[PDB]
Every structure is written in structure tokens, then in C-alpha cells.
Amino acid sequence: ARRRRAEVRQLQPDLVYGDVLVTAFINKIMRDGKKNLAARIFYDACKIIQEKTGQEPLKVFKQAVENVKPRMEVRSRRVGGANYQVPMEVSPRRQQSLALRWLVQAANQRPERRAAVRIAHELMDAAEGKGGAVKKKEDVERMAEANRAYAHYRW
Amino acid sequence: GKGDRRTRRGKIWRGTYGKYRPRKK
Amino acid sequence: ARKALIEKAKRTPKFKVRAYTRCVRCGRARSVYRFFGLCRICLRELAHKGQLPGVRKASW
Amino acid sequence: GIKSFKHKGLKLLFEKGVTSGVPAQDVDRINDRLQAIDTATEIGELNRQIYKLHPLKGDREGYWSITVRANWRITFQFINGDAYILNYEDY
Amino acid sequence: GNKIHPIGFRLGITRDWESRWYAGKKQYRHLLLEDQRIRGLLEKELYSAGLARVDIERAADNVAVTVHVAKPGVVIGRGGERIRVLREELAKLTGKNVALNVQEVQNPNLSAPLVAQRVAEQIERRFAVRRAIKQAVQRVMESGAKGAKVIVSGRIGGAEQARTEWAAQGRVPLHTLRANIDYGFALARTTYGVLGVKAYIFLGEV
Amino acid sequence: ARIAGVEIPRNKRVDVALTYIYGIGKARAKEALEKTGINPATRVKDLTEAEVVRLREYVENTWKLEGELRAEVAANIKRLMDIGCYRGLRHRRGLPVRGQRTRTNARTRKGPRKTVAG
RNA sequence: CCGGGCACUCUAACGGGACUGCCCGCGAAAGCGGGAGGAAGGAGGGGACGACGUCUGGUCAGCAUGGCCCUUACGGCCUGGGCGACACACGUGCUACAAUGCCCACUACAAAGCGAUGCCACCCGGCAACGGGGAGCUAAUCGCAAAAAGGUGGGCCCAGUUCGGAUUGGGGUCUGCAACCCGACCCCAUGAAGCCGGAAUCGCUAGUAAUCGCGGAUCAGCCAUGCCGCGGUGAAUACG
RNA sequence: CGCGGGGUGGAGCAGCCUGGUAGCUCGUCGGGCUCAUAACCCGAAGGUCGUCGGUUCAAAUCCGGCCCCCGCAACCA
RNA sequence: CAAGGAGGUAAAAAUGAAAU
Ligand SMILES: [Mg+2]
Ligand SMILES: [Mg+2]
Ligand SMILES: [Mg+2]
Ligand SMILES: [Mg+2]
Ligand SMILES: [Mg+2]
Ligand SMILES: [Mg+2]
Ligand SMILES: [Mg+2]
Ligand SMILES: [Mg+2]
Ligand SMILES: [Mg+2]
Ligand SMILES: [Mg+2]
Ligand SMILES: [Mg+2]
Ligand SMILES: [Mg+2]
Ligand SMILES: [Mg+2]
Ligand SMILES: [Mg+2]
Ligand SMILES: [Zn+2]
């Protein structure tokens, strides 16, 4: 019954960058608890960003996250055996989490061969507003758009 | 290939040694 | 088959592989520790009794 | 005709006369019951007062239950003049 | 229910051992069997003494054995028998230094094994169990105890129906470690079966 | 190149291409090209015809392989035809040869499930 | 490795160490929030501990025990068989379906435990399992063990394909009186199903889930992918 | 005995006329949900088309002979 | 700043188990 509001977990800043965000992204890359392979892939992809574009990956990655941020999402709620879906706003914590999660997932959805090039490209596509994650973001906002009827149920 | 008897990895998992996994040096 | 069966367990002749462990306090053939010569059941009894030198509850 | 057993003790008493699977004082009791279930051509014959016959309910539907003694039952499926799955169990 | 043996629960701090010797492997097994056969042989022809403990100590062929008894009446002055061959019959499968001592347990009403054994005798005397429990507790409580508790379980007064008679005065905290709680148990053999008597005796600590 | 009974594997490393023959596997593979003295990491694409001839001549001879040894293997099972042993009956019933568990599993010899129900 | 030294690390024996004691705010009190205080905090993180009682719960096959029954036998010994059977159904699992992947070589970084009726260094034969030798070790001395994921290099290049390892043929080793029913490994050749799971269903809130190997018990051997432990790298999220 | 209709998985019905595909509900069998049963959800299996002949390259289907089932008709003296 | 008197009321979900 959540007596405690569960305090927000804080991370360690990365190497060379100091991000309070990049490490969170590396973590999503991480599988089976191998931060070595995870971090390597991201920094690898950072080197890949430099090639296809003359931009610093610290902004390319930053803007990509900003473009894959759900303004509002759909929430299933009350009365009628939980029949309604109230479109709710998204907390900065949750926009944060969804952005990075959808990025990595869409990144591994790509037909490319190497994990680094998937990350790099999906970030470049998302920075422009083209990524498959941006599709996911825009999709979730469609659902939230179509439910404005009983949005006044709010909460 | 943790169950293939023709790998250093499968030989680890099985425990035993052999040609695919020599007893060091 | 229990009395004549704790006989064989101490008799131990005829082929070396036909010989087997067996709790002494009981007659248990399973979970017999070589260290005490007892089954897991008896061992627990005596450990609570205090009749097992040094043997003490494990908490960590 | 009894055609299949689920209880080994019951099986041995009727087949070989091996009594070491049942209680010793219920040997005659269990015997007369089994012979009755063997001779029975329909469930209606297994209806003597001393048997307290009844079909079981729930997941045991399709089964029957005559009383040996106390809380002890012989359960089975009777079908077309034959009983199957003769079990000895608690009520 | 399910509760751990209040003796084993201590062992380390509060309540020391009962067989205090050290050995490595290849020896522990043999010496423990001998040790237990001593306890087994003693219990038989020494029950009339009512022995609270059977402490045992060793030091390479030394085997010391301390028998705690309420009333050591069965020792009778040196060559008055009841000790001579009696402490010498141990070495018929031992052959080691059968050093048998005898202790005088002062108050038997504060020795848990003795309490339970007195109760278990009364069950076999066909006594009224509930009244026997009550008295034994008060008897223990009468001899200065800080808390007591006796438990007989099963087949009380014969009669087809296993029961459990319960009585306890004062304080008996089993969960506490600094407890000094003596635990005893006894089998009452009856013509209608077997029932067990637990006895808890408690004193202060800190 | 039609090495034994097969020819299929083109541009894909001779130590690997060799594997595509019933009788070669992996150990006999590098064993054959070190004994014939050919580079394992080659193209397989019809390289030096001489290396291919030597390879073919050694491999196809030496030990039995392809359809010939399939016949021998099948004949070794036909050994336990006649009035054969227990191991033959396991080849007869279609059940596992090495006495394993057949109460469950053993689907690789029994085949897919049939389901009786009762 | 020696001389020597034992301050560091470790080893294991007793101790010191926070009790929201100190500051602000709230309150009648308990207490709650917040802050320098320090390794630590408002039961620091885990163990052992399971009230009166409940389930005619479980256990006469650990053992004890009332009653009933068996005694040239419902007891006793032996050889062999069976518990391992298989048209099927459910549970708990292990290995996978690949490229944050697999293979080969090189090179690092643990803890907790076990061993002189055994662990077996280093050589020698052997593709290997293993066999011949044979040193040290009653073991923080010697041995089991190189930890493995990791790192470096190189090779496959996305196809059931160097993924996957089932199944089967042949040849061998070791324990054992003996391994056909029914043992574990080693080597050659086969290389199946599976390309990620229907209705449903499980675990876990911080060293935690996931992933990686290591030890022990029982043990001649071993059907252990189990159980009990050990450490390595190490997430996500909790509005409510 | 005269006309008309009909025999199809276990049950009840389609498909026949415009020959090459046998389909539907229920039941059955497997698996889920539940302490359990029912309901519900998932997934399967199941038919000599009454029978004997004939036409066809091919017959549940088109054509005859019997075999049952159903419905009409059997009037004037 | 403290409430009495007034009114719309959940859903679709049925059974019972085998000597006192
Ligand atoms: Mg044993
Ligand atoms: Mg088998
Ligand atoms: Mg407590
Ligand atoms: Mg019961
Ligand atoms: Mg018994
Ligand atoms: Mg079994
Ligand atoms: Mg396939
Ligand atoms: Mg594929
Ligand atoms: Mg929790
Ligand atoms: Mg069903
Ligand atoms: Mg149901
Ligand atoms: Mg007219
Ligand atoms: Mg009804
Ligand atoms: Mg009722
Ligand atoms: Zn025992």
C-alpha cells in the first residue's frame, strides 16, 4: 500500500561526459549485468556519430531523448471493471524512462548487423524526429489524443 | 554451447577435460 | 527386513562394494554422515541434547 | 465382475487371498463386499443397507462408495455389469 | 506449534555441553559411539538414582564420567558395592581409565530431568495427571524457582483420545538467550501406550 | 567442386566446406587439408585445380564416407536383425537404444506426441 | 628467495562504536520531518528465534510405542530380475533458438570449503579420457584449481548456417567380482527439434533481479542439469 | 398397394438441382481457470454420404433395382 | 469555522464434497 513514496534512485556519472543521463542509457543497453560491453557499445556508437555527422554525440543523444518524450500517455482507470482509459500527463521521471527504453528497443529492432551502428543510427534518426522510437512516441500520443472524451475524469 | 562436448565451454560445464580443453599448458 | 538388515551393515564381507553405511543409533541407510556414523535424524536429536562435542547451531 | 484395481492390498486379497494389505479384522468384511461387487450385474444389487451405497460428487463424479467399517470406503466405477478402479480409502 | 530444543538453542552462551572432548576424523565416530554406549549402559542400572546429567570428558585414554544425581544413595560407602565392579564394568568394551565420579544434585525440584521423571513415574502409577502436573509445578515453584512449565501430551488417563495437559506458573521466556532454562523429558510407558512429559525450569541470568 | 558425392559449398572456407560431407565433420576436415598441405582459409571457389585434385584424391579415398558408409552404418544396425540382441529390439520398436528414460521424453526417436486420453 | 623487520594486509580473541544522544521545525506526550556529526545511522543490511492455538494436517517405512495379525511362516539367506518399464498427462528444471553471438589462442582479477585406508605438484607415454612414475602435505606450509563472465588478437557474416546440440553407428578409458537390461567420461562420424513460445502461469524493491563460475555433503563409481553454500559483473521501476 | 419428399461424423441440420471443395451448432478428446464442479477460455480428433447396380476420366451429387422413414391420396355406387 | 435531515447505490458470476 506504498506507505513510503519510494525515493528516486540516483546514479553514478559516466566517464569523459558527466551526464546524469548517459549512464541511465548505458544501463538499458546492459544485459546480464555486463556494464563493460554496454558502455563500450554506446561510446562505440558515439564514435560512429562523428563519422556520418560532424556533431558532438552529447547533443545528438540529448536531442534524440528530447524528441522521444511522451507529453501525455493513456491510463486505464476506474468504474465498469476498469473500462475507461484516461489520458494522463507524463511525469518528468517517466518521460525520462520511456525515452531511453524505447530508444534501445527500437535500436535493436533495426535490421543492422552491429549493436553500435544500431544505436548510432537510431539516435541520429531520433535527433531528426524520424526514429522508430519517435514512431512509438507519436503513437502513444495518438492514443492519448483519441481519449480526450472522458479525459475530464482525470485524477 | 554449454552442452556440446567439443568446446572449452562445454567441457567446463561438464567439468571434465580433454582434447577440446587441455589441462593447462 | 530391518533386524537382519542392520546385521549385514556391520557384517561387511564378500566383495568390497557390497558394504554400505548405516546409522548406528538408528538403523537408517539413507543420509548417513560418515563423520558421525549417524543419520541426519539422530544427529539433529543429539545436537540439541548437547551430546555432540563442539557441535553448535549455525547462524550467519 | 471386478476388472481393475487401484488399491494393491484390495487387489491381493481378491486375487491371491493375500490378507496382509488390509486390516486383519476387516478381512471377512472386505471379502463379502468384493464378492458382492463381483457378482453384481448392476449397481442396484450393491444396495444392501449395510453398505450405505452412494455416488460421489465433484471431481469424483462417476464413482461409487460402499462402506466397509468406520470411516473406511471401497470406491469404484460401475459400468455395464463391471466395477473398475477398486480403491480402499478414507471417507 | 514447532519450537526449538531450548538446550540446543543455548549450547554456546548459557548451558554448556554434556560430552566435552576434542578429536579429528577417524576418531570422532568411534569415540562418540563408545560415549553414547556409556550413557546407554549407565541409564539402565542407575535410574533408581535418578540422574540429572551424565557429563563426559576425555584426554587420550582418560575418559572422565560425572554422574549428577539428586540422592546418590546407590553408591554406598567404598567397598559396600554399588560402585566397585559397577564403575569397572564400563571397561569391558573400553579398557580405558574409567574415572567415574558422583555429584550431589542439591534440589531435585530445580532439576528439569528429575521433575519430568517424577511426573512420568506418576503417570505409570495411574495418577490423576492434571493434578500431578499442578503439584509438580508448584513443587518446583515452592523451591525458589523463577518460573516453571510442565507438559504431558497424548492418551491422558488412557481413554481413546489424545490430549495435552498444560500448566505453568511464573515466568518462562523461551525466546530469550540469557535464559538459564533447564529442559527435561521422559517417556511414560503405559499398558495403553506412550506419552511424553516436558519440563521447563527457569532462573534469572544477565 | 564435386569432391566426394557432393559439390555444393562454394565461397565458404575449405575447412568448413569440407564439413558438408557425411563422413567429414570437423576433425577429419583440418586433418585432411594439413595432410594434403592446403591453406584452410581459402575461398573454396574453384581455386588452384591441383590442390582440389590432391584434396579429392586423398579425401575420397583413405576413409569411407558419403553413401557408402551410410550403407555400412545401416548394415551395422541390420546386424541386429536375424535373431539379434536387446539393442536390436530397441531399433525394432523405434525406441531409444541406450537404456534411458522413456516414461517422458525420448521424442527424438518416438516422434511427435500422439495423445491417448483416458 | 635470503638477512632482518612485523608498521600495512590478513588471521581470530576480547573490546570501543549512536542511544534520533546534538541543531532547526512540528507536538500535550509518544513521535515525525529536516540538518552539519561520522564508516554507519530514527529497528544500518542480513541470520538464529515461530505466541495461545488451527488444520481428526504429516510421519507406525528414521526411531519409540497400545492394539490387530504372521510364525517350518507376512521370518532368514542367496543368484537373477524389478524400482530405469512407455500410446500418453501434469510439476520442478537444464541446454538452446544466436552477432550486446558462437569458435580458437593468449592473458588477468575471487571467496567459501575439502584432502596423507586421500588431495595428488613436476615429468614420461597418449589427439584425449587416462596410464606409468614420483616430490611435497598429519596441511593460513603441500595439493585440489587454471576461477568463469572479463580483456587482447584472429576467424565466421546472419543462412538452421563454425547457431543448436538431440539421436544413432564405430573406437576407446576408469571405478567395480561384474557396468546387457541400468554407470560416468574421452575420440571419430552423424548432426534432429527448435528461428523465441496458445489459453494461461512465476520470481524478484539494492548487491537485490539477471548473468558467471567455484566449493561441499552423500559418494568405489555415478545417472547432480538436484540440494546446501561461495564469491565475480551488476540493471530497471514503485505515480499510486 | 398411387403420387410427393427424405436416409450425410455420436445428435440435429446444410452441401445434391449448375459432377471435381463434405460445412454448422452441440457433444466427444487434450490443456487451462477453481479447493472442486458447472459456466467460460485454448487446442484437437471424428463421416462406407441407406444399400445393390449403371453412366463418367471422375458420383454425396446424374440414372435404375430393391430396404426403411415421413407426408398426401384411396372418391361415385 | 462544526452537520442533521434528504437521493442516485454493486456487477454478470451458479453449485457443494461424500461416518457422528
Ligand atoms: Mg549410506
Ligand atoms: Mg529405461
Ligand atoms: Mg525476538
Ligand atoms: Mg488423517
Ligand atoms: Mg514401527
Ligand atoms: Mg524412483
Ligand atoms: Mg524445422
Ligand atoms: Mg536466424
Ligand atoms: Mg520486500
Ligand atoms: Mg474437457
Ligand atoms: Mg469445470
Ligand atoms: Mg362426388
Ligand atoms: Mg444442481
Ligand atoms: Mg453442505
Ligand atoms: Zn538413525
Curated annotation (Swiss-Prot), chain A:
Keywords: Ribonucleoprotein, Ribosomal protein, RNA-binding, rRNA-binding, tRNA-binding. Part of the 30S ribosomal subunit. Contacts proteins S9 and S11. Binds to the C-terminus of IF3 and to the C-terminus of Era. SUPFAM superfamilies: Ribosomal protein S7 (SSF47973). This is Small ribosomal subunit protein uS7. One of the primary rRNA binding proteins, it binds directly to 3'-end of the 16S rRNA where it nucleates assembly of the head domain of the 30S subunit. Is located at the subunit interface close to the decoding center. Binds mRNA and the E site tRNA blocking its exit path in the ribosome. This blockage implies that this section of the ribosome must be able to move to release the deacetylated tRNA. GO terms for biological process: translation. Belongs to the universal ribosomal protein uS7 family. InterPro entries: Ribosomal_uS7 (IPR000235), Ribosomal_uS7_bac/org-type (IPR005717), Ribosomal_uS7_CS (IPR020606), Ribosomal_uS7_dom (IPR023798), Ribosomal_uS7_dom_sf (IPR036823). The lineage of its organism: Bacteria, Thermotogati, Deinococcota, Deinococci, Thermales.
UniProtKB/Swiss-Prot annotation, chain B:
Keywords: Ribonucleoprotein, Ribosomal protein, RNA-binding, rRNA-binding. The keyword Electron transport does not apply. Residues 1-25 are annotated as: Disordered. Residues 1-12 have a biased composition (Basic residues). InterPro entries: Ribosomal_bTHX, Ribosomal_bTHX/bTHXc/bTHXm. Part of the 30S ribosomal subunit. This is Small ribosomal subunit protein bTHX. The gene is rpsU.
UniProtKB/Swiss-Prot annotation, chain D:
One of its GO terms (biological process) is negative regulation of cell growth. Transmembrane segments: none annotated. It holds the Pfam family HigB-like_toxin. The record marks F14, N31 as: Interaction with HigA. Keywords: Endonuclease, Hydrolase, Nuclease, Plasmid, RNA-binding, Toxin-antitoxin system. The keyword Nuclease applies. It comes from the Bacteria. The keyword Chaperone does not apply. Its EC number is 3.1.-.-. It is an enzyme of class 3 (hydrolase). GO terms for molecular function: mRNA binding; ribosome binding; RNA endonuclease activity; translation repressor activity. Forms a complex with the antitoxin HigA which inhibits the mRNA interferase activity. The heterodimer dimerizes to form a HigB-(HigA)2-HigB tetramer that is able to bind to the DNA. PANTHER family: TOXIN HIGB-1. Toxic component of a type II toxin-antitoxin (TA) system. A ribosome-associated translation-dependent mRNA interferase. Inhibits translation by sequence-specific cleavage of mRNA. Prefers either in-frame or out-of-frame 5'-AAA-3' codons (lysine). Also cleaves the first three AAAs of stretches of four or more A sequences. 20% of codons containing AA are cleaved and occassionally cuts even at a single A. This is Endoribonuclease HigB. It comes from Proteus vulgaris. The gene is higB.
UniProtKB/Swiss-Prot annotation, chain F:
It holds the Pfam family Ribosomal_S13. GO terms for cellular component: cytosol; small ribosomal subunit. PROSITE patterns: RIBOSOMAL_S13_1 (PS00646), RIBOSOMAL_S13_2 (PS50159). Part of the 30S ribosomal subunit. Forms a loose heterodimer with protein S19. Forms two bridges to the 50S subunit in the 70S ribosome, contacting protein L5 and the 23S rRNA; these bridges are straddled by the 5S rRNA. Belongs to the universal ribosomal protein uS13 family. Located at the top of the head of the 30S subunit, it contacts several helices of the 16S rRNA. In the 70S ribosome structure it contacts the 23S rRNA (bridge B1a) and protein L5 of the 50S subunit (bridge B1b), connecting the top of the two subunits; these bridges are in contact with the A site and P site tRNAs respectively and are implicated in movement during ribosome translocation. Separately contacts the tRNAs in the A and P sites. This is Small ribosomal subunit protein uS13. It comes from Thermus thermophilus (strain ATCC 27634 / DSM 579 / HB8).
